[PDB]
Design a protein around this nucleic acid. Structure first.
Ligand SMILES: [Mg+2]
Ligand SMILES: [Mg+2]
Ligand SMILES: [Mg+2]
Lengths: 143, 189, 144, 145, 64, 75, 55, 57, 68
RNA sequence: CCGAUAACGAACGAGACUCUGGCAUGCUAACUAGUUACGCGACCCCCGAGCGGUCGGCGUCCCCCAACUUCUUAGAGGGACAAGUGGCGUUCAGCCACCCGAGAUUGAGCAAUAACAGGUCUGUGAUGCCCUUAGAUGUCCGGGGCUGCACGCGCGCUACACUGACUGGCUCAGCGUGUGCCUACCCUACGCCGGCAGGCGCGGGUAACCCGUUGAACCCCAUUCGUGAUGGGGAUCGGGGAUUGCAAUUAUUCCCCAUGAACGAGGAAUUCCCAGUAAGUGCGGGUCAUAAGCUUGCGUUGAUUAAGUCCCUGCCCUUUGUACACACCGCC
């Protein structure tokens, strides 16, 4: 069976990919992962200390789903409702720096690259391993 | 055969009173896989009767502002409540819900305009549609007022409100208000 | 077993959410937006999406090949448009390529179960007026 | 492993010059120190490098003395200078995080130095009115009566 | 001394009453004794041909 | 209705009683077990998952808003 | 009168920079689509521009 | 085109010009039996025709 | 409620029935087809309202004389 | 409207009308919208699928190198009329119910005769009369004020919580705006730097070509919290950083770290509302150098109760009284 990531549950797939990136030490992280907030609209630090691997896992399948997604695209994707205190809630975008660090880390890992236009896209090896892990997690999920 | 929520066949159910028999839509044709179908049952009169009852349960459940548009939350609420009641009783959740509705339904009420100058509260009977409406309303608000300020969750309190109403245990909110209504009906009949 | 060009394309829309199903000869399989209906996002409504196929069973779905694309609206509207797109596309492909004497016994199940499976809901929205927050709700007023 | 209360537990326990609860989570329990919020507590505990799901009485005394040094002297422990309370102080120009009644001392100091220089903010502070430019025609009546 | 509860079948609806329209006069005959037809004042939307519970038989419905 | 003051963790008196009495009644939920044994509720959830990994109950629902467990089927 | 302070106040922005192209009022000015028109004036000339209350 | 303006602003500008032209022609020929005016605009030229009662005046 | 006809449609239906009776019929579609050509109705809505009233009066006149 | 009927025949307002929305696998056509099929790939596959699967990857107007409009766009049209049938009714106007039907009452605009000494001279180079007109009530510039607080009233937002909060993940909208006569002020993708608020360099868009496939909120899925004024609430207040401008103090706004106030569903009173409606929930426009707790629009999720009444509150009509006709703010 040829299993693609679109054939598997994304909640399990994201944590599978983050686990894989945890296993592979080539991926780089900034030192401020445990300190900074993930967005302007966030009220607290992420609970998970592996939130960076989670972020990379999310953006990997996002760039697979559609290409040309730049830093601003990432921040709009990961944006969220801002409680604004006493004002009515609104929408705020994610941190530009965390998207830059994750995308540049994937770029150094060399399964993503800048396109002929703006934004970035997967290398064929990228989706090769994405469908590999999707197939193995699908087998583990079904049986 | 219908398997609402993937189980709990609706063909083994029964209704003891003919008055609610034609005004309950738990039967095979009005049995749905999910309690979620906006079939426009309020467009003209007497169509909420044709609306399935389990749809009505979530309908009356979503109340009081903070959750007024959420249908999916009330659907998972009724799902968990059905699971809980079937685990702790063993009989059909829908059947025991129908029994709870029948037990909770107030057969009489008052008009409050029994005389013009002073309140008189002439006691009158209740149409079956008003019966089912009052029963479901009382049950939903009973769970609401059971689990507003406790560790106890809404699914748990909906489950035990239905259980208590089905058994007529006199501590259920709907049963108590029904008892009070019958008492005042006798008071000023 | 080798007839080509056996294809229909039937849409279904409700509340500014359209979903077009392309139906053609092939192995029994289902996909909306490139993913199977079982791997849908609001899984609490997953029984609604697998409802049409369980009505008439997989037996008549064994010889069909259908793929749906959805755009517009929200999640629930997408769900309803998808299921009505599925039912309408199957019934139209059936009536086109085989007799309607057996199409009747599959259309009647859908209509007796839910009219929306083959008739879209026309209600969309009402305009907000300049006197209150919404279409009919008005602003407050005070005499004192 | 989700076990009973160990013998070496404190249900109410003293930190600096004020007590904090024990039943609360370890990060949220220490925010009761007058000057630390949820973000500061979480970052200093993540630097403390311990179990976060354990309560305040499961903190052994070596962990107590470990966390207090970090919370008192953050700048040496790689805490960013933008994270701190008294950034660019008007006295020494040195970042610090003020805790417990030290924060009370600092706030009183700010009020009284504004009062000494007779700034508009200081005069509003003395008269108890609003200092951040908001209106006062209709609000504040709870505090005034 | 308490009369046993029984059922009444609606034959037709007479009109609205109660000084605000809140009530609805109806003509009902018991299926237990199909000869006896009495007027009763109900509370809620009632159609023709439905049935409803009656806690008493002797009591009839006056105006309002 | 004045104060709860529930136990954040077990002790001698509560742990053994939980272990001996939980797999008897039909409804095994975090809120209900908290009512019965005056435990906190984070502890109730943790104890429920530890008992599930022990095998004295079986999972039923596993929803992110409320989980259900039930006593072992006797056979 | 003196050249330096007769116009020394900058009004390159704000409500004083703009005015109605019909009556020079700076209240209720409609700047959409480059209209730059006082509202009670635009209600007067609405037909001429081509604006019609279709509904 | 960066020099050129949006079509929306184009139609707005032409309507504004028509309104100003009509008002000015009214205030100019009110005693001359002014009735109306129209414009046919082409890229080559614009032709403005004024409907009045006494064209001799 | 609210399906009563108006005098404008009613009188026109009466007049066309009385003047052109033989050409009319008991089918609504046929009635609107003849009305479309032999009468000048600017609107489709008014057209088919006229035709409906003509059909109803046809049902009346085939079994009892009317004020027409 | 029907019906009685000294009335018959009309007219205006209502209706009608225009726009709006659902239906047309019917027509007209679309490289500024696309859909299938095909050819390159890229990857999953070899247990074997192989006419296997995904791609918002590239092309088949890169013009000879495929079609068509189902989806989208907008013109011509059609389509719904109480039309059919059962019942009620004077058997008339009509009403109720049901089948077939997309639709059996979609929302709006316009709105008569008249009155309110209703509001506006502060919209106007609309305007009579009067006030001022050089120590100006003309006009310009500088500073403050329009925010100022023992208290009272109105429209709002925010919450009071476990039907929840926090973290992460999955994830779908439509209205509609976008570079300037004055007028110097646009919307913005991408890459880099900062933790954020921001800054830099390169483009695109005067617009179904770009922003944008508008990756919105809510919701949905998992973890943590645990009845504790608690991780609910974020009022008040401190320190620090950027943005706009000539200028930010009386804090313009936004961001980070700090305190965490009242508030535990609200007395008497009283507002709004019948189906995509109330509501929850965000997003556009107007305001704008900076900007929405306002307003006007849009979209999502989406109900309960009722198909009634003159009990209350108002309004109309008929009858009636009048010494009123400047019309009860009357007359006396
Ligand atoms: Mg009209
Ligand atoms: Mg603070
Ligand atoms: Mg007299």
């Amino acid at each position: 069976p040829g299993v693609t990531v679109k054939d598997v549950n994304q909640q399990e797939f994201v944590r599978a990919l983050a686990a894989f990136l945890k296993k592979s030490g080539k991926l780089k992280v900034p030192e401020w992962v445990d300190t900074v907030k993930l967005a302007k609209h966030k009220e607290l630090a992420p609970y998970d200390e592996n939130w960076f691997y989670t972020r990379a896992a999310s953006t990997a399948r996002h760039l697979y789903l559609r290409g040309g997604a730049g830093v601003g695209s990432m921040t709009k994707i990961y944006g969220g409702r801002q409680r604004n205190g006493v004002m009515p809630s609104h929408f705020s975008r994610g941190s530009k720096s965390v998207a830059r660090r994750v995308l540049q880390a994937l770029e150094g890992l060399k399964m993503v690259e800048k396109d002929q236009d703006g934004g970035r896209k997967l290398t064929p090896q990228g989706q090769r391993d994405l469908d590999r892990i999707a197939g193995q997690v699908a087998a583990a999920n079904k049986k | 055969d219908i398997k609402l929520f993937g189980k709990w066949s609706t063909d083994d159910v029964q209704i003891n009173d003919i008055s609610l028999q034609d005004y309950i839509a738990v039967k095979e044709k009005y049995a749905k896989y999910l309690p979620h179908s906006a079939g426009r049952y309020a467009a003209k009169r007497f169509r909420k009767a044709q609306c399935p009852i389990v749809e009505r349960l979530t309908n009356s459940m979503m109340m009081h502002g903070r959750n007024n548009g959420k249908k999916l939350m009330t659907v998972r609420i009724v799902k968990h409540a059905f699971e809980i009641i079937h685990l702790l009783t063993g009989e059909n959740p829908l059947q025991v819900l129908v029994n709870a509705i029948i037990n909770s339904g107030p057969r009489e009420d008052s008009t409050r305009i029994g005389r013009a100058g002073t309140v008189r509260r002439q006691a009158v009977d209740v149409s079956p549609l008003r019966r089912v409406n009052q029963a479901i309303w009382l049950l939903c608000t009973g769970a609401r007022e059971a689990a507003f300020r406790n560790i106890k969750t809404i699914a748990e309190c909906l489950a035990d409100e239905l259980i208590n109403a089905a058994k007529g245990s006199s501590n259920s909110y709907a049963i108590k208000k029904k008892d009070e209504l019958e008492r005042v009906a006798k008071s000023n009949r | 077993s080798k007839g080509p060009l056996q294809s229909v394309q039937v849409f279904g829309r409700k509340k500014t959410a359209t979903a077009v199903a392309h139906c053609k000869r092939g192995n029994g399989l289902i996909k909306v937006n490139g993913r199977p209906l079982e791997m849908i996002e609001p899984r609490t409504l997953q029984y609604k999406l697998l409802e049409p196929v369980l009505l008439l069973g997989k037996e008549r779905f064994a010889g069909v090949d259908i793929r749906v694309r959805v755009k517009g609206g929200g999640h629930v509207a997408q769900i309803y448009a998808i299921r009505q797109s599925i039912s309408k596309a199957l019934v139209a492909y059936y009536q086109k390529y085989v007799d309607e004497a057996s199409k009747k016994e599959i259309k009647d199940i859908l209509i007796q179960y839910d009219r929306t499976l083959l008739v879209a809901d026309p209600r969309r929205c009402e305009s907000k007026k300049f006197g209150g927050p919404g279409a009919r709700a008005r602003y407050q007023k005070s005499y004192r | 492993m989700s076990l009973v209360i160990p013998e070496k537990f404190q249900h109410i326990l003293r930190v600096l010059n004020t007590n904090i609860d024990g039943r609360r989570k370890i990060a949220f329990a220490i925010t009761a120190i007058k000057g630390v919020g949820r973000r500061y507590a979480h970052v200093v505990l993540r630097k403390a490098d311990i179990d976060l799901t354990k309560r305040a009485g499961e903190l052994t005394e070596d962990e107590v003395e470990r966390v207090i040094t970090i919370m008192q002297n953050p700048r040496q422990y790689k805490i960013p200078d933008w994270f701190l309370n008294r950034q660019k102080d008007v006295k020494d120009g040195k970042y610090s995080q003020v805790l417990a009644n030290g924060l009370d001392n600092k706030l009183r100091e700010d009020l009284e130095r504004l009062k000494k220089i007779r700034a508009h903010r200081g005069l509003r502070h003395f008269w108890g009115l609003r200092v951040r430019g908001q209106h006062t025609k209709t609000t504040g009546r709870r505090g005034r009566t | 001394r308490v009369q046993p509860i029984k059922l009444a079948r609606v034959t037709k609806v007479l009109g609205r009453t109660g000084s605000q329209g809140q009530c609805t006069q109806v003509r009902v005959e018991f299926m237990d004794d199909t000869s006896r037809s009495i007027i009763r004042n109900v509370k809620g939307p009632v159609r023709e041909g439905d049935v409803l519970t009656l806690l008493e038989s002797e009591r009839e419905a006056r105006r309002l | 209705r004045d104060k709860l003051n529930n136990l954040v963790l077990f002790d001698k008196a509560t742990y053994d009683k939980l272990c001996k009495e939980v797999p008897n009644y039909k409804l095994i939920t975090p809120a209900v077990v908290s009512e019965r044994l005056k435990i906190r509720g984070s502890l109730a959830r943790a104890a429920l998952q530890e008992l599930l990994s022990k095998g004295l109950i079986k999972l039923v629902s596993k929803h992110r808003a409320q989980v259900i467990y039930t006593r072992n089927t006797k056979g | 009168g003196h050249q330096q302070l007769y116009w020394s106040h900058p009004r390159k922005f704000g409500q004083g920079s703009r005015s109605c192209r019909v009556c020079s009022n700076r209240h209720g000015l409609i700047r959409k689509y480059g209209l730059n028109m006082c509202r009670q004036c635009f209600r007067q000339y609405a037909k001429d521009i081509g604006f019609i209350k279709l509904d | 085109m960066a020099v050129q303006i949006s079509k929306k602003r184009k139609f707005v500008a032409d309507g504004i010009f028509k309104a100003e032209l009509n008002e000015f022609l009214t205030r100019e020929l009110a005693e001359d039996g002014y009735s109306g005016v129209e414009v046919r605009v082409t890229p080559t030229r614009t032709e403005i025709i004024i409907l009045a009662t006494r064209t001799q005046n | 409620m609210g399906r009563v006809r108006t005098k404008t449609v009613k009188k026109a239906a009466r007049v066309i029935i009385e003047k052109y009776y033989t050409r009319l019929g008991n089918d609504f579609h046929t009635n609107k087809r003849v009305c479309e050509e032999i009468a000048i109705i600017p609107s489709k809505k008014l057209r088919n309202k006229i035709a409906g009233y003509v059909t109803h009066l046809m049902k009346r006149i085939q079994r009892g004389p009317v004020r027409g």
